[PDB]
Amino acid sequence: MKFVYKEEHPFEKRRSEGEKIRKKYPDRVPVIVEKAPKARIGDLDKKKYLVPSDLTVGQFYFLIRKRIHLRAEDALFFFVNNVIPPTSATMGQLYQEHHEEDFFLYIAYSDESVYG
């Protein structure tokens, strides 16, 4: 899954900025959120988020839904490494399990249940 943020910031700068942002906000995880390419769905103004590490995936669904101006009845799926993460997991658990070597967590969102 291609993230534009990776193409526009080289790995080394990403890594040093992730280190800095984990030090400044130790109880928050930094997350990159991008729309999946083929998804017919609202785009998001910002990509970089600081998220409380005890926030659940469901609560993240709620907040992201608020930001793309979706109704609760409209569909919204998250993907971490092309897999839908469990709704009950915390963002801290997701970070520990799936953070990349630049200290960032990468999440894609779509209106479809399969990434593409």
């Binding site: 970089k48 988020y49 600081l50 409380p52 926030l55």
Partner: peptide
């Protein structure tokens, strides 16, 4: 460029 904090 910056990070947007998200809370409930």
């Amino acid at each position: 460029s910056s990070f947007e904090e998200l809370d409930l």
